[PDB]
CSV table of C-alpha atoms in Angstrom, one decimal:
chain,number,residue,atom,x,y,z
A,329,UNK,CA,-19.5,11.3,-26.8
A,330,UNK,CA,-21.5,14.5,-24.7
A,331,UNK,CA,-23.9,12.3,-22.9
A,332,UNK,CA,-23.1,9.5,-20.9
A,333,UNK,CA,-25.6,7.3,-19.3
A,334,UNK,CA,-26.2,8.3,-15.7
A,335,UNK,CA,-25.2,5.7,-13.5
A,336,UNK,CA,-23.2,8.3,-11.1
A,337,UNK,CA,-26.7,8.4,-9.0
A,338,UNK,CA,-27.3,4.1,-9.3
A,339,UNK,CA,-24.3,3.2,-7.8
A,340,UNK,CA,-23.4,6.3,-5.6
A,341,UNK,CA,-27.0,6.9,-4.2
A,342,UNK,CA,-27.1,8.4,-0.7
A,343,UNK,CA,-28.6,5.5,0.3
A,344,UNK,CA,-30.8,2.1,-1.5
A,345,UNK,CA,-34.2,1.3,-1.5
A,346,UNK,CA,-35.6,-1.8,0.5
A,347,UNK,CA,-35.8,-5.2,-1.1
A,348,UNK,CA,-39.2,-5.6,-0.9
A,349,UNK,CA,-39.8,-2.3,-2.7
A,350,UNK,CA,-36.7,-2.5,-4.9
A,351,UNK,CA,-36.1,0.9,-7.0
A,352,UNK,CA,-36.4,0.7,-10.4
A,353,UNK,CA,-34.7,3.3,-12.9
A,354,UNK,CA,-34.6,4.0,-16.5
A,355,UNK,CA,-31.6,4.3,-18.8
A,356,UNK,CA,-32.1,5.2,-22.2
A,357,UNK,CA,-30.4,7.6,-24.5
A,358,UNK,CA,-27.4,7.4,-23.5
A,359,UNK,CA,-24.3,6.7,-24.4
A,360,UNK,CA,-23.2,3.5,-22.2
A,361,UNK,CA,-20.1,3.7,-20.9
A,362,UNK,CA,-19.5,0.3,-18.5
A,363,UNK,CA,-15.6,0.7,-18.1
A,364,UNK,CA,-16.4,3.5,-15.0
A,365,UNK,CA,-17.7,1.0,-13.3
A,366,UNK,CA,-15.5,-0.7,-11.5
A,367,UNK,CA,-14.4,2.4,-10.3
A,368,UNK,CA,-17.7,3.3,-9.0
A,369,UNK,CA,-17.0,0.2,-5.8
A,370,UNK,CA,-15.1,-2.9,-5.3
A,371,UNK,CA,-17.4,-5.0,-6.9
A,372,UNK,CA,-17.7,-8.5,-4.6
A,373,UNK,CA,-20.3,-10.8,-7.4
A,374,UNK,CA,-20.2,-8.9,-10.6
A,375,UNK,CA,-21.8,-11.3,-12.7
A,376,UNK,CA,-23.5,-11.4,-16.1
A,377,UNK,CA,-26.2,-13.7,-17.5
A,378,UNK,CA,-27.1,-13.8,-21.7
A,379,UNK,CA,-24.0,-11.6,-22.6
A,380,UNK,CA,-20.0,-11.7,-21.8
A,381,UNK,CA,-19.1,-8.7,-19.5
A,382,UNK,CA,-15.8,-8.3,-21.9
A,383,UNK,CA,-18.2,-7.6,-24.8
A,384,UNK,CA,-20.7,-4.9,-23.0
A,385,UNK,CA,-19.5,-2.1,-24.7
A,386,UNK,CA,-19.8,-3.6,-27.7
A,387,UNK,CA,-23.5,-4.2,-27.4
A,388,UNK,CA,-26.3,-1.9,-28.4
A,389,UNK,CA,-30.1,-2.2,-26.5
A,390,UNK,CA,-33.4,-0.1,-26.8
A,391,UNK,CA,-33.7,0.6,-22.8
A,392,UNK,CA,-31.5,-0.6,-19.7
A,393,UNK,CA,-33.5,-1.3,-16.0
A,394,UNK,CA,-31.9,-0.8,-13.0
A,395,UNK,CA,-33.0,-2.6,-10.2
A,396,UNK,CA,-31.2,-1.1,-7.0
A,397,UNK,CA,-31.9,-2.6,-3.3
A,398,UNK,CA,-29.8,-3.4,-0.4
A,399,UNK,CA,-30.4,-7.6,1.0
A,400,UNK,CA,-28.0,-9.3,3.4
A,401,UNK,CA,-25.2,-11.8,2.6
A,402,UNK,CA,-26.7,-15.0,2.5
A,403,UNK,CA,-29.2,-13.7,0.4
A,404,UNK,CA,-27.1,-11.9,-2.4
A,405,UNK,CA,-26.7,-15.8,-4.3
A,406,UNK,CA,-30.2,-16.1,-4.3
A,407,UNK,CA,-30.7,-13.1,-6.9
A,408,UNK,CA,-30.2,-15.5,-10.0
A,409,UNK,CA,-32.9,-17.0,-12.4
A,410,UNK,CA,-33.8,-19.8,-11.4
A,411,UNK,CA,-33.6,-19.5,-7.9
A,412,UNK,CA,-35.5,-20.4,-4.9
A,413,UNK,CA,-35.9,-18.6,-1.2
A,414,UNK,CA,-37.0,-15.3,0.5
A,415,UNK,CA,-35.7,-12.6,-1.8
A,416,UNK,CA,-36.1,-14.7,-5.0
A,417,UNK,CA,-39.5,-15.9,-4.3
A,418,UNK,CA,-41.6,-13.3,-2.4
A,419,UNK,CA,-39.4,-9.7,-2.5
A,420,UNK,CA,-37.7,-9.6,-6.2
A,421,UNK,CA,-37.7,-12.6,-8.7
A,422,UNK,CA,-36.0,-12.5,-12.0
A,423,UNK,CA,-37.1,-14.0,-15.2
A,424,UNK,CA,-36.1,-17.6,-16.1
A,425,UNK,CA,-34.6,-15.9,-19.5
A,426,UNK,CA,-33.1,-13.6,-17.8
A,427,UNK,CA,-30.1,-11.5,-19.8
A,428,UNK,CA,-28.7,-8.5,-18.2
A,429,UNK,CA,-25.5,-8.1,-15.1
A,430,UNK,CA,-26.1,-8.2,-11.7
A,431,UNK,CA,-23.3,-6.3,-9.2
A,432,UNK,CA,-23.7,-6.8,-5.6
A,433,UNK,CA,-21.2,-4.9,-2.9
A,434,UNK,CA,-20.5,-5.3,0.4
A,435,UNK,CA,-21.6,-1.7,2.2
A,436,UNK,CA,-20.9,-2.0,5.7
A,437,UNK,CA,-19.7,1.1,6.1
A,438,UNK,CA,-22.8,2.8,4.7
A,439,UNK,CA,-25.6,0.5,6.3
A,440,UNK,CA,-24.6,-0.2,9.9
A,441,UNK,CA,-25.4,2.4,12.5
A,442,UNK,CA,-24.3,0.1,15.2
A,443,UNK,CA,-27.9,0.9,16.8
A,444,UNK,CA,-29.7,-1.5,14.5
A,445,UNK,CA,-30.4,0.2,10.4
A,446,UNK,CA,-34.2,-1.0,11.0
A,447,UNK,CA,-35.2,1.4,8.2
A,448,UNK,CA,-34.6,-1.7,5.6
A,449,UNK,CA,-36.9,-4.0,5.4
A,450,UNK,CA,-37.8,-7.6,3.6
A,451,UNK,CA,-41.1,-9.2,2.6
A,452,UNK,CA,-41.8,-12.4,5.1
A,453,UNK,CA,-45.0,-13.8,4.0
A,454,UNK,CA,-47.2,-13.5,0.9
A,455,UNK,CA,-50.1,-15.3,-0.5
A,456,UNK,CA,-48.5,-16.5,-3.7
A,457,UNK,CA,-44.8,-16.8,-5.2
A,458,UNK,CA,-43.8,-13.4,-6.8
A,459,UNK,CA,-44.5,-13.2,-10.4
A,460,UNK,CA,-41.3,-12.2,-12.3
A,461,UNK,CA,-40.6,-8.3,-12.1
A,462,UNK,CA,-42.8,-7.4,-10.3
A,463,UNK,CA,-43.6,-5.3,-7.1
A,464,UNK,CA,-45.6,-6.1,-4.4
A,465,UNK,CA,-45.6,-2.8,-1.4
A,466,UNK,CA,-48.5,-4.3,-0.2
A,467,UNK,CA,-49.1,-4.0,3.6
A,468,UNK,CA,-51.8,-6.1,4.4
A,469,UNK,CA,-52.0,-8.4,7.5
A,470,UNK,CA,-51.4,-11.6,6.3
A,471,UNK,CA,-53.3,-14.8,7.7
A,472,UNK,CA,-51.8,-18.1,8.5
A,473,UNK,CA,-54.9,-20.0,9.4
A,474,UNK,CA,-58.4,-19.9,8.9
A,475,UNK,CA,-60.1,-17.6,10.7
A,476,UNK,CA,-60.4,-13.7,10.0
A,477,UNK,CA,-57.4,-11.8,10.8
A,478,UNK,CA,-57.9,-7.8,10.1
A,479,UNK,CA,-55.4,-7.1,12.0
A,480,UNK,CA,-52.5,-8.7,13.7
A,481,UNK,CA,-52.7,-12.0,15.9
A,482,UNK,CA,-52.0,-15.3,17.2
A,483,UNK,CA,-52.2,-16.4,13.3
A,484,UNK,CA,-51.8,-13.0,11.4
A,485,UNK,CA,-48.8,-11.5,11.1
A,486,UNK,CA,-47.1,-8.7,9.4
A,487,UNK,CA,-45.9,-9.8,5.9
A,488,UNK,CA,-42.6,-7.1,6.2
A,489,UNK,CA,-39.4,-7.8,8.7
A,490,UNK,CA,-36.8,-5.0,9.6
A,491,UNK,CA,-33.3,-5.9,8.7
A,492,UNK,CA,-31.3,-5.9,12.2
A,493,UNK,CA,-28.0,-4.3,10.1
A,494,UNK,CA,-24.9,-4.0,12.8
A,495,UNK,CA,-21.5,-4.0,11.8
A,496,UNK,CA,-20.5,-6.5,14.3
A,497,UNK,CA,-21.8,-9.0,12.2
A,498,UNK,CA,-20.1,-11.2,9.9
A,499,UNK,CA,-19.8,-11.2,6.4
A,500,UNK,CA,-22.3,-13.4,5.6
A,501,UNK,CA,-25.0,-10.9,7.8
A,502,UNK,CA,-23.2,-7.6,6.5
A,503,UNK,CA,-25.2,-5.6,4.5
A,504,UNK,CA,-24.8,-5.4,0.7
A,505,UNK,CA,-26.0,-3.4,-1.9
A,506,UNK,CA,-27.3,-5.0,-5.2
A,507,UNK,CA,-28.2,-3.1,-8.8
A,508,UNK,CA,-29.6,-5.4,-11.4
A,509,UNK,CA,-29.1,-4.1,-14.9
A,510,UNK,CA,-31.8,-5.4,-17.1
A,511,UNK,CA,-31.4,-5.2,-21.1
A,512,UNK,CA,-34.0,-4.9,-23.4
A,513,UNK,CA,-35.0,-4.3,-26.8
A,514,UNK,CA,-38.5,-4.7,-28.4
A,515,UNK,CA,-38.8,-3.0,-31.5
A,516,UNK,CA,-37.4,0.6,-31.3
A,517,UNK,CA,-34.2,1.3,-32.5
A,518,UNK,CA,-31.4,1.0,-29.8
A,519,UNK,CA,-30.3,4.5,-28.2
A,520,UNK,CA,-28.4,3.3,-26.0
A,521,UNK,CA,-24.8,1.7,-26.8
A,522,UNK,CA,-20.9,1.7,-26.3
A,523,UNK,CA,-18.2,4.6,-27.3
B,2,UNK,CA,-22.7,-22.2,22.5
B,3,UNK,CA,-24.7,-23.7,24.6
B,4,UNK,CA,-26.3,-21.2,26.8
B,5,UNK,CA,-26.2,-20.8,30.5
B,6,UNK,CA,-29.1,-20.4,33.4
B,7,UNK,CA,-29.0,-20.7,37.2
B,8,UNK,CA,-30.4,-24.1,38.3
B,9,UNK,CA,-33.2,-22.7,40.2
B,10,UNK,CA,-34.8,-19.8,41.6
B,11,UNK,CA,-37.5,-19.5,44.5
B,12,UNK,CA,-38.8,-16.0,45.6
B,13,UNK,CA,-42.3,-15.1,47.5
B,14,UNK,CA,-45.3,-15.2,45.8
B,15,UNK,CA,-46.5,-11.7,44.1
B,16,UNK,CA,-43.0,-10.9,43.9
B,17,UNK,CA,-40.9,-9.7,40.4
B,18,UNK,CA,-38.0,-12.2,39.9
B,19,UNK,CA,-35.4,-12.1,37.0
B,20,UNK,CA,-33.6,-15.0,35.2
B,21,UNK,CA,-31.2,-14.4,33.2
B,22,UNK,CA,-29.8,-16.4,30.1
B,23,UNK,CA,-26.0,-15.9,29.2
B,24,UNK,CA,-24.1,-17.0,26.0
B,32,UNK,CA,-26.9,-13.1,19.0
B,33,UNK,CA,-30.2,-11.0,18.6
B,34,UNK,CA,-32.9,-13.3,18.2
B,35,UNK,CA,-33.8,-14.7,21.9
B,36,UNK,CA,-36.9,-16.7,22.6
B,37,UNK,CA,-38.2,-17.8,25.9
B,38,UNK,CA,-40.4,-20.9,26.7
B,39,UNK,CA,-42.5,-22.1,29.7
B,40,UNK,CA,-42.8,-26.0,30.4
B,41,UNK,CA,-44.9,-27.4,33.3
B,42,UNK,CA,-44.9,-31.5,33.7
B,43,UNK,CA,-47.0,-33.7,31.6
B,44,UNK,CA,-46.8,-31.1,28.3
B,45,UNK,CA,-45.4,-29.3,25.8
B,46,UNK,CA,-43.7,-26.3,26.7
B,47,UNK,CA,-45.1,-23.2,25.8
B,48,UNK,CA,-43.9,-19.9,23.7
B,49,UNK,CA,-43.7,-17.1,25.9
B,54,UNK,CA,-46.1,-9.9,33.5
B,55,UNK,CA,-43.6,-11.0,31.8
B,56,UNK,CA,-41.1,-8.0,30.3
B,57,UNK,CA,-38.1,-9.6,28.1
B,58,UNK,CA,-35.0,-7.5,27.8
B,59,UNK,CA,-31.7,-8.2,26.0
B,60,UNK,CA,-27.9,-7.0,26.9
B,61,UNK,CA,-25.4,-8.2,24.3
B,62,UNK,CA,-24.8,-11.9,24.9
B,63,UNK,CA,-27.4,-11.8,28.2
B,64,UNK,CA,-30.9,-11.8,28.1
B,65,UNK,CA,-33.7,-11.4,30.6
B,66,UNK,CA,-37.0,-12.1,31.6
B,67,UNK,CA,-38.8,-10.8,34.7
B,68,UNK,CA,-41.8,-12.1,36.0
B,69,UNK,CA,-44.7,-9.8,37.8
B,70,UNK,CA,-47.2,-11.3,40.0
B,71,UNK,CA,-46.0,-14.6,40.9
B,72,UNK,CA,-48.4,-17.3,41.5
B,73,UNK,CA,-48.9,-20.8,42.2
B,74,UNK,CA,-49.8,-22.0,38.5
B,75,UNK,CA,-46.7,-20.3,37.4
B,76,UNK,CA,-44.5,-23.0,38.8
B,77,UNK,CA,-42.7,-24.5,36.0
B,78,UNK,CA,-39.5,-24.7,34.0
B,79,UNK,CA,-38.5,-22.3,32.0
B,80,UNK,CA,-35.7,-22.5,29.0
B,81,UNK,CA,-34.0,-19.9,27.2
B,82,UNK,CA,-33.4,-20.6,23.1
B,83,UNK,CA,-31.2,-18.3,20.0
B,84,UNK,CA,-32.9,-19.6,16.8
B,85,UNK,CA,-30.0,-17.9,15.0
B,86,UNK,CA,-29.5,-18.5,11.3
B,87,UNK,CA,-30.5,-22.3,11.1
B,88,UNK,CA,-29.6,-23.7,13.7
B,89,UNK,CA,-31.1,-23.2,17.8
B,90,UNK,CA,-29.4,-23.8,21.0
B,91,UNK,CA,-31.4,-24.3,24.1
B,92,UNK,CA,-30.3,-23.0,27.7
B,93,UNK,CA,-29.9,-25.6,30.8
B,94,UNK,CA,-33.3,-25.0,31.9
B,95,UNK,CA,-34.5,-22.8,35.3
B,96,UNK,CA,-37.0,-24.2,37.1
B,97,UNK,CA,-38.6,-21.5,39.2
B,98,UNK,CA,-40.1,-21.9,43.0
B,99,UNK,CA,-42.9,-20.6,44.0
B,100,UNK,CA,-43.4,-20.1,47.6
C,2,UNK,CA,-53.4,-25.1,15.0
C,3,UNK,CA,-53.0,-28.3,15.8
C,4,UNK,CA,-49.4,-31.1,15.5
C,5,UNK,CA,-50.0,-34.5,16.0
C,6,UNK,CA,-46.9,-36.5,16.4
C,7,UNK,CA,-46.8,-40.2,16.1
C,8,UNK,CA,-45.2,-43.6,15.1
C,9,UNK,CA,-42.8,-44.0,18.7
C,10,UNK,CA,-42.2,-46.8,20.3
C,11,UNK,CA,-39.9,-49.1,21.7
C,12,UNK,CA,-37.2,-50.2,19.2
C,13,UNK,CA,-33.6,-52.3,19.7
C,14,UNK,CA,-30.7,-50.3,19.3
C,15,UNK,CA,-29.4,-49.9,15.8
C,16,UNK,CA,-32.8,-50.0,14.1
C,17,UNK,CA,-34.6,-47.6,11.9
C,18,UNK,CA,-37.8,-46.1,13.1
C,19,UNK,CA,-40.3,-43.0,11.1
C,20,UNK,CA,-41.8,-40.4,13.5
C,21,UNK,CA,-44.7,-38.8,11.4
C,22,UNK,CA,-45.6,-34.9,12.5
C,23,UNK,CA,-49.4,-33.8,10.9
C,24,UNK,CA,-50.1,-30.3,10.9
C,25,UNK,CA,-53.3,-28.7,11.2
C,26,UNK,CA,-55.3,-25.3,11.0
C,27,UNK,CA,-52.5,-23.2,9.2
C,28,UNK,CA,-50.7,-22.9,6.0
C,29,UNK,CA,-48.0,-25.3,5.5
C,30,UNK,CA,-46.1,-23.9,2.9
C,31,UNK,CA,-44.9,-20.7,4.8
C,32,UNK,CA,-43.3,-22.4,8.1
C,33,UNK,CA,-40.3,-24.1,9.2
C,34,UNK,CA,-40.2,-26.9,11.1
C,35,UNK,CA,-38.1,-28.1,13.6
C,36,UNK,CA,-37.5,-31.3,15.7
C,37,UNK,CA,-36.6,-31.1,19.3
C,38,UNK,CA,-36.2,-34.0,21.9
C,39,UNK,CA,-36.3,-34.5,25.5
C,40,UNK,CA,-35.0,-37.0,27.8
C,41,UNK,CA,-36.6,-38.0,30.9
C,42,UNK,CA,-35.2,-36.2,33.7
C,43,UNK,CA,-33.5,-33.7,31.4
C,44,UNK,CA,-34.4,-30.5,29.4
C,45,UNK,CA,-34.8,-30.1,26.0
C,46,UNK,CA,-32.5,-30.5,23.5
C,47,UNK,CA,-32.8,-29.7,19.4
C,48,UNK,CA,-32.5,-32.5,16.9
C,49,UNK,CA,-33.5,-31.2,13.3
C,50,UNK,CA,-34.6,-28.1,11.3
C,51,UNK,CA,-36.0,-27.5,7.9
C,52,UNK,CA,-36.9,-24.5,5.7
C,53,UNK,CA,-40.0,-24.2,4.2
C,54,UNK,CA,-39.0,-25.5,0.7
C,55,UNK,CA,-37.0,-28.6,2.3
C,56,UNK,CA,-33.9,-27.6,0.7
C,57,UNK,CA,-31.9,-26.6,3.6
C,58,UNK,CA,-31.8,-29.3,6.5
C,59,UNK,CA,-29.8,-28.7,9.2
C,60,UNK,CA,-28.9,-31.3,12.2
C,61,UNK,CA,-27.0,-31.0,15.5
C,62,UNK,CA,-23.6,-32.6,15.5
C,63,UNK,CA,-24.6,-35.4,18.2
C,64,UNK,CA,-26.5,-37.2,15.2
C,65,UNK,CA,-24.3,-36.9,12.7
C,66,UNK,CA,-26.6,-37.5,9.7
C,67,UNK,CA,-27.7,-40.3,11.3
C,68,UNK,CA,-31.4,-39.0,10.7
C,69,UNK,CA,-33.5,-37.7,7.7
C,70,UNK,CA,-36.3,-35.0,8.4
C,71,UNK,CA,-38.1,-34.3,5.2
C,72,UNK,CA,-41.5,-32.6,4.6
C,73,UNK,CA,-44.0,-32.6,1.6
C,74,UNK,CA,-46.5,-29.9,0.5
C,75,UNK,CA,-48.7,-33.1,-1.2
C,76,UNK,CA,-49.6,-34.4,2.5
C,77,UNK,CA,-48.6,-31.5,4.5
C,78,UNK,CA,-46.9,-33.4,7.2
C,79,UNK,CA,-43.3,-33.2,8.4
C,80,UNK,CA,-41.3,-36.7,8.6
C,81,UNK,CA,-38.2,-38.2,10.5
C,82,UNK,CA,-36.3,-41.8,9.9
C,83,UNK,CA,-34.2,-42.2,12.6
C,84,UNK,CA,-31.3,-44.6,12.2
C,85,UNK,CA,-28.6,-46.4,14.3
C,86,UNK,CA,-30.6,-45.7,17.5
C,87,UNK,CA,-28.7,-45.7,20.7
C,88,UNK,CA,-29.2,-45.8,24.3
C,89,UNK,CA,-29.0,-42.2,25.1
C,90,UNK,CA,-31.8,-41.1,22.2
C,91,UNK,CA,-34.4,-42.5,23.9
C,92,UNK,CA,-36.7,-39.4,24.1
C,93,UNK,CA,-40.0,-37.9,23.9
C,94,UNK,CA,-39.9,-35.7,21.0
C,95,UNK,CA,-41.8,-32.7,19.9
C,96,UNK,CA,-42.2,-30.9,16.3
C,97,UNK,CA,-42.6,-27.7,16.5
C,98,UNK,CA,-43.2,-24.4,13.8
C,99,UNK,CA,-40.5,-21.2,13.6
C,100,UNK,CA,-43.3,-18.6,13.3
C,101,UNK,CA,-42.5,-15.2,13.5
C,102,UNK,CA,-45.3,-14.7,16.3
C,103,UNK,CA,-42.9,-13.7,19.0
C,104,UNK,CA,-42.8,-10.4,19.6
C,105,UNK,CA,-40.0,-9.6,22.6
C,106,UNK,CA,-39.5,-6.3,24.2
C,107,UNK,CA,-40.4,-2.4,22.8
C,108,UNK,CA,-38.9,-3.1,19.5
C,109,UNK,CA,-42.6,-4.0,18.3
C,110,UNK,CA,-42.6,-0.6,16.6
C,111,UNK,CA,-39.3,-0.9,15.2
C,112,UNK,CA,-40.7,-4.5,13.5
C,113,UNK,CA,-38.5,-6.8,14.5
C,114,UNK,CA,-39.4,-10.8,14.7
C,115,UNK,CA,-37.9,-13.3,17.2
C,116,UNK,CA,-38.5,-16.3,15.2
C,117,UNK,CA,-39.6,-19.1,17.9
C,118,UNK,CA,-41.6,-22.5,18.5
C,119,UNK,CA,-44.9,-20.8,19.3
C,120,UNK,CA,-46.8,-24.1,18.6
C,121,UNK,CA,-45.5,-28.1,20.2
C,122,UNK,CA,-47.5,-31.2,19.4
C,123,UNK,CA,-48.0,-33.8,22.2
C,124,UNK,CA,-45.1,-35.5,21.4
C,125,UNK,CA,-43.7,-38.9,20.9
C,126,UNK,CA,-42.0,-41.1,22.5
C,127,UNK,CA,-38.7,-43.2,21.3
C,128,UNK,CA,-37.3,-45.6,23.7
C,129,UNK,CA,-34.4,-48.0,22.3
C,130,UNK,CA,-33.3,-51.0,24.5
C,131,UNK,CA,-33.9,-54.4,24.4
């Protein structure tokens, strides 16, 4: 084993990307080590979806996604297929078929500044529901009623909210940081797999 | 947590008067003269842990009213006492 | 923008009444609606709030779950049964719409939303006694 998937920079980046614009890496071959993991944080909602987390190193795939981005308590249960809200309908949905992990963890230590972490922001208002995996950075004004907005007003508002991150709040208002790990293989032969 | 507000305040008219609204970040402020619905909200907001603020710049006669203090926190929203200003 | 509320009245106590709230001029899918109710004499007080998607409903502890506040995307309208009226929830009530329209202090540039009422209907009025 000489090269090991890099997931020292997914899960110890200096800091996340926004919901709304959720960072999305590549990892392909690679040997997959998953056991380091749990070292990497104390993981609050390690959870897997398709495959049993015991088994992941005994698993081969073509490619691996990493979807990193930093959402607030309340909002970690609605990554999940199937699921229904802000983040899971107009920031970052998943696919109803979904098969991959997701591991969310608490980082109030990392995202409170005690002067308001404004530089994280969430997707309020959008034409449509989000198509799954997909991306939408999008900054125009968005109207509510029927007259023509260009611009913000009484009906036309700005589609993206700043997170208010303190670390007076609760735990359910903390920060937390998510990375989805998406599996796939298509056709090519897998290059990434276990020890 | 209902909120608290002083019962009422008078003060001349063309004259800056505060109200303040003591208990938390979202704060909204609403005007309400008799016979309709109040209204969202010369007027500068501030906020100061659990107080918040509203000053008003130019008094008038049409800005007699009542004025109420809300925290449409998570989901569900408390509203204040109620101030009903004087105008002189 | 426009909210109509209607279908108050005079009612006995205990009985089951349906205040009706229809929305006009902006997209119904994308705000959440609240009910709030005044007494005469009094100030305002909040009764009932809904998400968007109807799934969360939340109520103030003074009615229990006494009253169901639902809303459709079929008619867009927002909808109340009230039951086991008493004599102290005789009120004129108002529906109003959490938009994000409020804008408070400097923070504009820092893009932060005070989520408030920024559009009442008329309102309706409930009065239960005999």
């Amino acid at each position: 084993v000489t090269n090991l998937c890099p997931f020292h920079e997914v899960f110890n980046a200096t800091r996340f990307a926004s919901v709304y614009a959720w960072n999305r890496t590549r990892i392909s071959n690679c040997v997959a080590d998953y056991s380091v993991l749990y070292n990497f944080a104390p993981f609050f909602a390690f959870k897997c979806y398709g495959v049993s987390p015991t088994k992941l190193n005994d698993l081969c795939f073509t490619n691996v996604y990493a979807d990193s981005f930093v959402i607030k308590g309340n909002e970690v249960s609605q990554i999940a297929p199937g699921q229904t809200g802000n983040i899971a309908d107009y920031n970052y949905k998943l696919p109803d078929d979904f098969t991959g992990c997701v591991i969310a963890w608490n980082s109030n230590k990392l995202d409170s500044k005690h002067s308001g972490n404004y530089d994280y922001w969430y997707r309020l208002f959008r034409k449509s529901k989000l198509k799954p995996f997909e991306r939408d950075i999008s900054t125009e004004i968005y109207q509510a009623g029927n007259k023509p907005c260009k611009g913000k007003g009484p009906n036309c508002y700005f589609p993206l909210q700043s997170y208010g991150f303190r670390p007076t709040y609760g735990v359910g208002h903390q920060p937390y940081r998510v990375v989805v790990l998406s599996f796939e293989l298509l056709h090519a032969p897998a290059t990434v797999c276990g020890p | 947590s209902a909120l608290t507000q002083p019962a009422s305040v008078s003060g001349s008219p063309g004259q800056s008067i505060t109200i303040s609204c003591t208990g938390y970040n979202y704060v909204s402020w609403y005007q309400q003269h008799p016979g309709k619905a109040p209204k969202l909200m010369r007027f500068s907001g501030s906020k100061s842990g659990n107080t918040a603020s509203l000053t008003i710049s130019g008094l008038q006669a049409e800005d007699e009213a009542d004025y109420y203090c809300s925290s449409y926190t998570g989901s569900v929203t408390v509203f204040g006492g109620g101030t009903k200003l004087t105008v002189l | 923008v426009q909210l109509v509320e209607s279908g108050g009245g005079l009612v006995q106590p205990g009985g089951s009444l349906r205040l009706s709230c229809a929305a006009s001029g902006f997209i119904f899918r994308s705000f959440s609606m609240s009910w709030v109710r005044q007494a005469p004499g009094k100030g305002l007080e909040w009764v009932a709030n809904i998400n968007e998607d109807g799934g969360e409903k939340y109520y103030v502890d003074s009615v229990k779950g006494r009253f169901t506040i639902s809303r459709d995307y079929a008619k867009d309208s927002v909808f109340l049964q009230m039951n086991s009226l008493r004599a102290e929830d005789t009120a004129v009530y108002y529906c109003a719409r959490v938009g994000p329209y409020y804008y408070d202090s400097a923070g504009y540039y820092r893009r932060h939303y005070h989520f408030g009422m920024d559009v009442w209907g008329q309102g309706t009025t409930v009065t239960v006694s005999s």
